[PDB]
Structures are given as C-alpha cells and as structure tokens.
Amino acid sequence: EEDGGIIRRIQTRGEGYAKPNEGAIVEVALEGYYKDKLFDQRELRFEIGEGENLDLPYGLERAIQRMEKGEHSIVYLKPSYAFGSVGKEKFQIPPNAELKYELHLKSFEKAKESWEMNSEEKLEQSTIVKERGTVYFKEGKYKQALLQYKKIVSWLEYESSFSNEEAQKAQALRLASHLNLAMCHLKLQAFSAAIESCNKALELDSNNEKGLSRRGEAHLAVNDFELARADFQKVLQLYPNNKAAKTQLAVCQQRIRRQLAREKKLYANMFERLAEEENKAKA
Amino acid sequence: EEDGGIIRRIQTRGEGYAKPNEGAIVEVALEGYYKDKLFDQRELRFEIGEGENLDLPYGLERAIQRMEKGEHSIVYLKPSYAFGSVGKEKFQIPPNAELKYELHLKSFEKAKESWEMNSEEKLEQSTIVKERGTVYFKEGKYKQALLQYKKIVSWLEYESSFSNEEAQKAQALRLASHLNLAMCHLKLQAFSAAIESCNKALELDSNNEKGLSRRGEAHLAVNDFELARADFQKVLQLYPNNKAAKTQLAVCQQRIRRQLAREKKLYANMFERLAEEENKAKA
Amino acid sequence: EEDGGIIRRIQTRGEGYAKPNEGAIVEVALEGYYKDKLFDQRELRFEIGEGENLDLPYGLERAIQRMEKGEHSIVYLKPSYAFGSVGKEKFQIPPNAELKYELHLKSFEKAKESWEMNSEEKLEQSTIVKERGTVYFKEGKYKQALLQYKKIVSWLEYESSFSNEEAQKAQALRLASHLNLAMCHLKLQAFSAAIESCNKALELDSNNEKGLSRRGEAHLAVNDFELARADFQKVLQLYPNNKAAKTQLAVCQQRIRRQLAREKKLYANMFERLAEEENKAKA
Amino acid sequence: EEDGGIIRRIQTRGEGYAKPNEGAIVEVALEGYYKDKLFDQRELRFEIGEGENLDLPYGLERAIQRMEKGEHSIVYLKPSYAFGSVGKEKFQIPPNAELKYELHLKSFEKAKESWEMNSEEKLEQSTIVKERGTVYFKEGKYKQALLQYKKIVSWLEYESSFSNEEAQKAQALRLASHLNLAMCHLKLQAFSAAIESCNKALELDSNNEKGLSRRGEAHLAVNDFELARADFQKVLQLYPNNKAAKTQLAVCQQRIRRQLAREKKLYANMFERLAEEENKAKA
Amino acid sequence: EEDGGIIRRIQTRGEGYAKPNEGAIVEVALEGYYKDKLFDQRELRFEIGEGENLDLPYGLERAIQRMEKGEHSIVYLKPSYAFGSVGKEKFQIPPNAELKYELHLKSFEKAKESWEMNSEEKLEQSTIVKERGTVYFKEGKYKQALLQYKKIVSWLEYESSFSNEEAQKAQALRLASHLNLAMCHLKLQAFSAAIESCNKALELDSNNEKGLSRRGEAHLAVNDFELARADFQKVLQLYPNNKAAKTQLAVCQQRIRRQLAREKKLYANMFERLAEEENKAKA
Amino acid sequence: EEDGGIIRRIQTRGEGYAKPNEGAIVEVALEGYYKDKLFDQRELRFEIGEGENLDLPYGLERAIQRMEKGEHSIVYLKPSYAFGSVGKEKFQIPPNAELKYELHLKSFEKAKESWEMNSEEKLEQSTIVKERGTVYFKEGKYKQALLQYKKIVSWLEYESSFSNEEAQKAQALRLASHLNLAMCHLKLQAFSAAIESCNKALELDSNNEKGLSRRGEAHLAVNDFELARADFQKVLQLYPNNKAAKTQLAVCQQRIRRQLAREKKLYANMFERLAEEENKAKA
C-alpha cells in the first residue's frame, strides 16, 4: 500500500477500541529524531489534518490515525512520508531524510463524519467550525483557518433535505464561508484564489459589499485595474458611503491614467519608427 | 503551421490589400475537390469562425483570412488543415485526406477588433450580436448561437470606461449573454457548460429565475438530484407560481426516494453478509 | 516485441537459406485480403523500406524479410501492422483492420550495409543510391527520392578513414545530397525540412548558389519575407545574373512593403483610439 | 457526469423496481439507426459486459443498465459512447458518429455481486462461470470466454474464509482458470499474455504439464527459443511420454542451431572487416 | 550524457588499455573535493555498481569505468552526475553541487559478461556470488545483497544449453536467488518487491515453505490480512509444526475480526442514518 | 500571472516616471533577508538579465524593473521567485524559501530594443555588446559573455533592410558572434552547444579555421574521434601549419586505433564462444 513508508513499533498498547480519524482533536506527546539526534519534542493538542502547520510530517499524522488512547509507539517514516524533498530547515533536516518519532497518544475525540451528520447537525458542526476558523483567523494562523471554513462549503453542498428554513441558514453559512475564505486568501496573498471565493460568494448574494470589495481588492492587488475599477465602481453604486471603494477607485484611475500615457507614447514611437523604415524602403 | 499546410495559388489578383479578420462576414464562391473529384460547390456568405458548422475545413477559413476583395484563387489543404482525423462522411471523405478548393473572395467586411470601439459602440454592437444570437438559436444552429454570445461576454470583459448607466446596461447584457449560453449548452446537452454559464449569470444576479432553473435542469439531466432539488426549491421560494420548478421538483423528490430505498436495502444486506462472516469466523 | 503482430503460414518452401534485408531489392507477386475480399493484386519489385509509398503495409515488408527465395507464404497482420490507425481508403480498408496477404518472394539481392563497406565502397554506393534518388525525382516520386538521398548523408557521416581526394569526393557527395534533399522537400512543400537541408549544404559550401536560393524559396514560401530577402540579396551579390533571384527578391521587397503600410496604419489607429479614451478619462 | 453522452427517452415505462447490473443476462429487442437509416436490428440474449463482441456500442449496454422489464426506450449515443473513432465497418458507420437505438428490454436476471456471495456460493458461481466459459471456448468465441474465466480469479482472490477443504476447491478453480486463460490468449495469439497466465498457474502447481507446455508454446510462438527449449525440456523431465514437447523441443534445437550459424558468420565477417580497417590504419 | 558531465584529466597515464566493466572489482584511492574543500578521502575496493551504497556519485563510477591499471587521474563532476537533486549530508553537500575527485585506479578485474561463460562457468559463478550475497546480508548491507542475487537470476535467464542435471541445479539457484531477494526486500521493507520475488520463487516451487511464509509476511506487513491469512493457512496445511505461521495466522485471524466489527457497526449506522432520511423525506 | 509572487513595499519615493527594462544597466544597493537574517549586503551595478550569475534571485530583477530612480523599496518574494526549488547554498537559503530584500535603485540607463534601432544602430549596438561579451570572456565570466554574444545573433536575424556593405558588416558580426559563443561553450564544457554554434558559423564561412577547429575540440571532447578527425583533417588541408590541428589529429588517430584493437578482440572472442557452443550443440 504505502509500501513500508510509515513503519510503527508499538511500545505500550493502548486499552481502547477507538482510533483517531481525520479531523479528530488529539493530545500527543512527541519526540522527533534525525539520526538519533533529537530535533522535535513537545506535547500538543492539534487537529488531525493540520499538522503541516505545526511542523509535523504527514506520515506522522497518518500514523496517529492507527493508535489508541494512552499508547506509546515509535514511528519510522521514510523521506517520502517525512519532510521529503524540502526537509525542514528550522530542524536542520535536509532533503530526502528518514525520521524516527516517539509519540504517545494521550487522548482524542473522533470527529463526526459528514454522513453521520443529520440535517440540523450539519448546520451545527458548520457554525462550530466557522468560529473555530475565525479564531484561527484572528491569531493570524490563516492557513489553519482555511481548513475550517472549507469544511463548511463541503458539508452543506449535497445535503438538500433542508426545511426551507434550514435552507436559509445553510445558504448564509455558505455565503459566510466564502467571504471568509476570500479574507484568508487575501491575507495569504493568494489573489487568484481570493477571486474564486469572491465569485462563489457573489453567486449567493450578487450585491454583497464584502465580496465585491475584496474581489475588487484582489484584482487591484494583481494590477488588473480595469476589472478592479469595475468592482469598486459597483460597490459605490450599491454602497456610496464606502471608504475603501472611493479610495481604491482613485488608485485605479491614477494607474489606468498612467498606463494609457505609457502605451500611447509607445504606439506613437512605434508608428514613427515604422514610417522611418518605410521611407528608406524607397530605393 | 509555418510548414506547408495551406498553400494558396492566386488565379486572379485582388484589389485592396484589405484582408478579412476573425469574425468577419465574408462572401465567397467555392469548389471543393478530393482527388480531383467535385464534392462541394457553393456560393455562400458566412462569418469567419463558423466555417466548421457549414462543413468548411478550418484550413479554408485560415486561407480566406489572407485574400483581398474580388480575388479568385485556389487553396491546397493538408489533412490536419482540411478535415483530418475524421474526414467528412456527407462528402464521402476518408481520414487524413488532402483537398483542393477553387474559392473566389467576392466581398467582405472586417469586424471591430474590440479596442476599436468606445463604450457606446460596444453596447451598440453587443445588442446587435445579441440579436443574431436569437436567430441562430431560433433555427436550431446552437453552436453558431454560442459564437455570438461569447462575443458579447468578450467585448464587455475589461472595458469599464462605462458610466454607471452604461455599466448598468453592460451588466444586463453580460447577464443575458450568460443565460443564453446556458440555453444553447442545454439544447446541446453540454450540461457542465450549462452549469458554468448559469453560475456566471447568478454571480450577476443571485436571484435570477432562469439562471437557477436552467442550472436545476442541468443537474437533473446528469442525475445530480440532490442538487437539481436545491435549485428548484430556491426557485419556488422566490417564484411560487413557477410552472416547471414545481413539477421537476417532484421528479427530484421522487428519484431521491427510490435511491434511498436502494441504498438502505443495500446497506441492510451488506450488514447481514458481514454478520454471517462474523459468525462462521469463530470456529 | 511484436507479440504475434506478424503471423506467417508458409505454403511452399523457398531455398538458399538467405533472406532480404533493409534495402534489399525484391521481386514479389502478392494479393491483399480483407475479410476474404481481394483488395490488391500485383506483381512488383521494390526496395525494402519504400513499401509505404507503394501501399504495402508496414508489417508486410517485415515479413518479406523473413522469407526465402522461391517461397510462397500467407501472412497475417494484426491491425497495428496492417494499415493500423485509420487504414487505407483506396483499398476501402477501414480504421483498426486485420489483413491477409498472399505473396510469393520471387527474387532479390540483399543490400550492402554501412559496416560491410570499406571507404571506396561507400563512395561507390553513395553514387548509385544518388542515381536512384534522381530517377525517382524525375518521375515525381519525391518521398522515394528522399528515401535514397538520405542514405548518402548517413553512410558518409562517421566515416573518417578517407584520404583527401576521398575527403573531397565525399564532401561533394554530402553536399549534392543535402541540396537534392532540399529540392525534394520543396516539392513536397515540407519547407522547414527544406530550410534545414539547405543549412546543412551551406555548412559545406557557404556560397552555394542553389543552397542559398532554395532556402530562399522556402523562407519566401512560408511568408518569411525578411529572411528570404536576405538569401535573395546574397544569391545576387555572388551571382548578379540570377533571374529567379532578382524576381523573388522583388516579391519580398513588395510583400514587405505592403506588410509595413498595413502595420503603420494599425498603430496610427490604436493611437487615435488611445487618445479618445484619454479624453473620456478627464470626466 | 458522462455529460449527455448517453441520452435516453423512455417510450413505454416498465413496471418493476429491478434494473440490470453488469453481468446480468438480458433479453433485448434492438434497432440501430445512423441518420435514421437502420443499420442494426435483432433480438438477443446476451450478458451485460460482452456487448463489444456482439457489435453493441458500450453506451448502449450502459443504457440498458437503467431500464426496466418490458420498457421501450430510445437511446441517443454521442460518438464517444458509440463506436467512436473507429466506427463499425460492417454497419457502414464511419469514425465520429452519433447513434439512435430503439431497444426494448424484455427481461433479465441481475447477477449476484461478489460481496453478496457467501464463501461456498463463490466456489459455486465460479464453477458455473468456468463452464459458461468453456462453452464459449469451444464455439471459438475466445474473447467472450476470457470474461468468464477472469471472473473466477477475481472472485476467489481476497475471500479467504475457506474451510481448508473449500480452500483446495478454490485453489483448483484458480489453477484451472489460469491454464484456461492461457489457452484463450494462445488462440488469440496474445503470447505475452499467455505467459502471464501460465506463470500465475505455475505459481499454483509449479510442475503443471499444461502450464509448462503452453508457456513453452508461447515462447516458441514469439521466437524466444532458448526460453521455449527450457520449458519443453522441463515438460519432458516431468512427463516423458509427451508428444508435443519432444516435437516442439526439436523445432527449438533446429532454429537455435541455425541462429548460431548465422550469428557466428556475422562476427567472423565483422571481425575480418574490422581487421581490414585496422591494417589500412597503418599510414 | 555526451555533454560534459564527467570530464577526466589524466595526471599519470595507465598501462594496459584494459578498462573495468560494470560489476568489476576495482581497487581505488580517492579524494573528493567540493568547492576545493576535502570531504572524502579513502583507499577502498568495491564492485562497480555498488558505489551508491559506499557514498560514491555514479559519475565517479562511470569515470572509473574508463581508466586503465595504475592510472592516477582527476575527475570533474556536474550535479546530475555527482549527487544532484539531494546532495550528501554526511559530507555536508548542497543539492546541484559540482565536485572534483583525485582518484587513482590501482588495480582491478573485469567481470564475465555472461555470454563469456559456458554452462559450467555459469553455475560455478552463480554459486560463488550466491555466497557473496550471504555476507552482504549477514552485515546488514541489503542493497548490496540485491546486486549479487540479481546477478544470479540474470546469468541463468536465457542460458538453457543446460543438461537436465545442470538444469536441475540452475533451477535450485534461481529458486534460492528469488527467496533471498524476498528476504532482502523484506528487511528493506520493500514489501511489493518481496511479494513479486516470492511469486517468482513459488512459480519454481509452488510448495516452498519460505516462499509462502515471506509472502505471507509481506502481506501482513502492508495490512492485506485476508491474503497474509491465505499464505499462512497453506503454510500450516503443508508444514504443520511451522512455528511462525501458526502465530501470525492468529494475528491475521484477530485483525480481520476487529475489521468485521468496525464494518458491520459502520454499516449498521449508515443504515439508520438512511432510515432517518427515509422518514423525514415524507412531509 | 505571478499571483502575488513579487510584492513590493515602497519606502522612499523615486522620480522621473522612468523604469529599467530588460538589459538596462542599473546601480543598486541591496541587502538580502531570510527570516530577518542578513544574508547578502552589497552595492553593485549590473545588467538586468544577468542577475542569476550574481546570486540575485529571478524575482528581484523583475522588481527592480518596476522601480524608479532614487527609489528605496522592500520587496517580498514568494519561494518560486526566490531561489525557489533548491534555494542557494552560499547564503544557506534552503529549498522552498521566502526572501526579503531591501534595495535602493540608485541610477540606470534603459536599453535600446530591437524595434527602436534602425539598420545603422543594430550594427552599432552589435559591436558594443560584442565588446562586453569579450571583456567578460577574459574575466572568465563565460555565462555572462554568452548573455551578450547571443544578443548579436538575435538583433541581426530578421533584419534585412541592409545595403550590401551592411549585409557584409552584419555577416562579419553574426560570424564573430557564433564563433565566440563557441569559445564560451567550450569553456563551460557545453560541448553539444559548442558543436551547434560552430555549424552556425560555418554556414556563413565554411572554411573558417576557428570554426572547424573548435567543433573539432568539442567532437573530440565528448569522444567522437571519428567526427573530430574529420574536422582536424579539414582544418589541416586548408591550413597546413595548424599545430593544435596536427596534435589533435594525432590523438584521434590514436584513440581510434586503440578503440578498434579493442573491438576486433571482442568479436574474436564472441566468435570462439559461439563456436564452443556449436559443439555443446552436437550432443
């Protein structure tokens, strides 16, 4: 299967049937060695699936998904399932490195899986995760915030057995999830992605001040002024007392103003230089 | 190209050094020859870009884009520039064939490049091609309808010199262009395209009655019932007396029901097969 | 490996224990069958390796090579060795088809191979082959001519044990062979290959009137006015009395002259357009 | 999903919950039209998954899997889900052709699916299918025989809850399935594949006369004499009174005998020709 | 290559025009320099092909294959010929680096090419390298064990001039070669390789006690319990008092049990979630 | 699109409304940061496009180009524009890394571009650049020399409005430029590129002593004895007093002489072996 990439020797079995699943919050006590020299060691409460943002190899989170409460194990990770080709510089680990870890799974809470969730449970796990996400947002842990928000959109997609009331709630969570994902992507300077989320949001509320402004901000951030000017221009029509727009629109006009002056002289010079070659062409 | 694919032999020089551009309305008289046998003789008038829908190899189109008014001429085409991998059965023409055309460029008329038009011209012209859309669609020439609408969306893409009132109209055009493409893709049974197109429309009007309907139609067509349901539901909780929504909603509501029975029964059985092993697995 | 692609049922015994090789000249009588239907009956003698230009499926030549003199055989070709992808129209053989040929290997003369020939022999054979090359060239069998000229370049490549007058004799040959190859490409309108074969001629004699001209016709053929003018300017300085040169040199001078008038006007216009937008941008 | 490739209009609904699944034996009454001209029409009892060997497009078998007893429907198949790029020559259908069919599902029997099969049911459905397969074999319908035998191997792979008695039965079915698959592949002149099946068989009974001989036959069929001589040579040791082996071994010796005589003269001539270049190399 | 990757500068000419071939035992004294700093100094003796296991770039190996006895010399290596994409951390060497080696080819000894040996030599030598296998394995140098055994399987692959008695021994060698590779792959945790290797062995001895055991081990390692079970079962129903089989069989028997509980419970739940929808799906 | 790859925080304003272009000569003071750590502090003036040869990350040059004179800025580069894949060892910048540069654009002179220069100018600039080329060549900055010579070939390519003495002047330039480019490749041991640059010289003067020699050194460099002998034979017939020629011509004569003695013996042996097997094959 993974052909011995994640090799694990169990030191002290863990009484319990339970094992963590993706999304499970876990309490671990880990020790990381690169050629028996320690390079990682700490007790952390993290969510399976976010380890990459806490400098955990993913073979390690994979290995945690096969442990039991209180268990003590040693995990052997080939370079592929470790920090592979990049290594981790803050841990002096270089490209293509095998790793050994001594983790000890203290406790955990499996995460409810999409299908286990009845209709109103989804409107609930979703609101929970939105908050979890905003929290991450405010701490500046933007990448970790994306994992929470994305969850919402997914969960509330196919599920349609909605009471028309529940429907609206689900629709608002989706609009909220998207506008929030755009904020993240903007903070990560992932503009092309900020526009996608904006568009998705807008497909929900085509007049959304937030979606419009952010999309407009993302275009501008990428120097796509014409499209940028289009969104702030719309934000104004819809929402005149809008500080950012009025200002951002200005920026767009100035740059677009310059842009034309450049281009114009360009054609002028190309024109003239062209006429030149032409006359000489009169042998 | 740039390797003897379409070679043209002038039988009578032109007069205007003016050459048709993509999307231009040319008027031509032609003759097609496969292994020197006549297979197509016609005097027609078409827009450069729809030749493939009028049984014209795009080689012939590429060539035509190089002639000048009143220019009689002859074109030689190599497989990948004529028909190629498939040939033309209505013309009895084997794959990879090579052809000779005796085309005469009677008259024509280039087509505003886009930067060639100001705000006004752009809205003027988009309204006009919007119209052409109408007919190609009325007559069942859907692919041809697509080239027209796509034109609209293209022309009003970066241009934002608009003036709020104008911008309001360009908005409506883009919206009407996206809703029609959805119609053509649907009649063409390009259900994903219909969906993308509906999405671009809804992003311009999250409440559109057609946008949601045609997207619901698209989902129902390709069997994604849980989704087609969501669109119809939202359609009726916005437009109560909406004829089609109510009916098809039933369809979705019905199909999903059956599906549930199948799945539950299925799960019921998988369970018992498993219990069966559970049992014999003792001894 | 062929994996049963070519299957041969020997009907009558051959003799000699010898077999045709790549390039052998064979005399064979054959008949092609598709679903027990006769679709090709002939008696011809050709060179192993030119069969394609004769409507003889790739596989069949690979079979004749495994046949003895006086042998009568039935060969079965899996589609991929028949006419494979897209068959053969003149025989009405459709795409992905199996064929049955009945052929009789009458006579043949195996062919000397690069390693068997000493230095005198390569120069001897290189001239024979060149003869064949030219015959075919006059019968219009261009691809078959290419088949021959190409042999010269190869056979004379790595060979270096020459003795001056031989080094010369050979250079004369490579040169003659690159130039003819150029004539062939120009006739089959394979312009890039023609340009290429010309450069390999000029590497051996950079003032070669024919080499410069032909690369001039090809550059000029694919509308590379600039580059062609250069060759035709050079051909004339070295050979002032070259008519085609003066002519062709005139055509470029003209097409280049019109091309520019066309471009100058383009910029004149984008300029004006850019200016009028500069005023719409003072509102 | 398949994006409208298989479009079906139901003419007369079919009372019944049931629908066919792959492997289901069906009774159909079909009519095939290429541009409203009939090209296929017949009533057949066939097994879903074998249609390709009865000239049925696979979009058609796909469409049958969504019908109900007695139902009458029309099925629209785009060229992709029809006879695509090859077309069907016996039906005059050319590459890239859409198709319309008027089939009528008279009756069917869903096929038990692997997981429904308890342990001894698998030893049963397997023996049934082996016979079904041999039958096909004898009629010369080799490709259709492969589908049945392959079923066995698959079914009896992971299932291991075998009573040690059942085990042997399952192992014999597997050995039987493999040696049978080799016969097919040999008859289809799919030698590379005949060896795979042989090897698999041999991994079950390393002394198998049948597996050895066929593998030996497949090597020989591909001119891999050394390996061929190895297997008949083994068959003899194991089973001396073996007609084929003794004879086939002979063939191998003769060809291998010739092969060496050829090669040897080759090196002799290469040697001598080499010495030649050498002496001359004494300037 | 064939583009300045490994350039060698002779510091002292050789004496024998004899050059080491792959698999040859060379004896060398070398010095490695990265940006002119010494990082590796050693006088060792190794077999051309295992250099990568002795921290030698294969550039250096390729180069060494070109020298002659007693030849002092210097080699320049370009990234993709030195270490390259990963570098050498034990030598502190960044990716893409370039190196300079001052190697001296003291002595060596080519290695029988294969066609260079008759039946006897082949069995003599294979027994010998079989032995070398033994040691590299005893010392934990598994990769190095692999090159040895692979050699055996290679040498006795097409050679069948054997004489039944000999052929019996070559059989045993191939069998022992495949069972050892299974051992090395397993200690290397290349479980698929271990399985292929076991399969090649069983095809030579369908009853092998190790073959089945090591394959069972391989399956159990990568968690395919239903299969590891089958091998152990068959192992004990052939070798009753087989220590390991009995135990691990238990393991498989246990793990599969748990798995069943999980699946059944899982199915149990999926069922009820479905019934839940079934219900609310009414109103 | 870059999508936020290059992010610049302008600290102090510039002036002039002008910006450096590809090939501009700039004066800038910079400092490179990685995790707030200083890893590069300098004050240099270089040509936009040679930055790589100076340890200036690709992205940074693309930034300087967006800077004004006298401007002070902070630029943020996403890993893919930093040193990206595999970083930079001398700065200890590890694979996949983000960098922060603080640079001050002091002065610069934009660069004339192919279209701005009339015929006299290209010949003027082609000489300036060639000068730069040669300086760098003497300082050993080979890659930087390549950067320059290459400009000549390009700039002089499509230009054809020359007036004989100009056509000549230019040919002298292209020739000088192909030959120097050859010297550079030989120094960077990029032999295939050297051979290539030589052919482009000989196309313009097929008796060029330097061109023939250098292609001789390269052919000889990669062990193409045959081909190199040819060039060294020719260089000598045209220039009897060429020492390196006579020398090199001797080396090939020798390496070729030994190569053959080596090959002859090979065949002698395979011959004997093939004979001894012919006797084992009489049993």
Swiss-Prot record, chains A, B, C, D, E, F:
List the GO biological process terms. Answer: androgen receptor signaling pathway; chaperone-mediated protein folding; copper ion transport; embryo implantation; male sex differentiation; negative regulation of microtubule polymerization; negative regulation of microtubule polymerization or depolymerization; negative regulation of neuron projection development
- Chain positions with Omega-N-methylarginine modification: 229
Provide the tissue specificity.
Answer: Widely expressed.
How this protein is processed and modified after translation, per its record?
A: Phosphorylation by CK2 results in loss of HSP90 binding activity.
Residues recorded as bearing N6-acetyllysine in the entry = 138
Q: What class of enzyme is it?
A: isomerase
Q: Which reaction does it catalyse?
A: [protein]-peptidylproline (omega=180) = [protein]-peptidylproline (omega=0)
**Record-given protein name:** Peptidyl-prolyl cis-trans isomerase FKBP4
Q: Which gene encodes it?
A: FKBP4
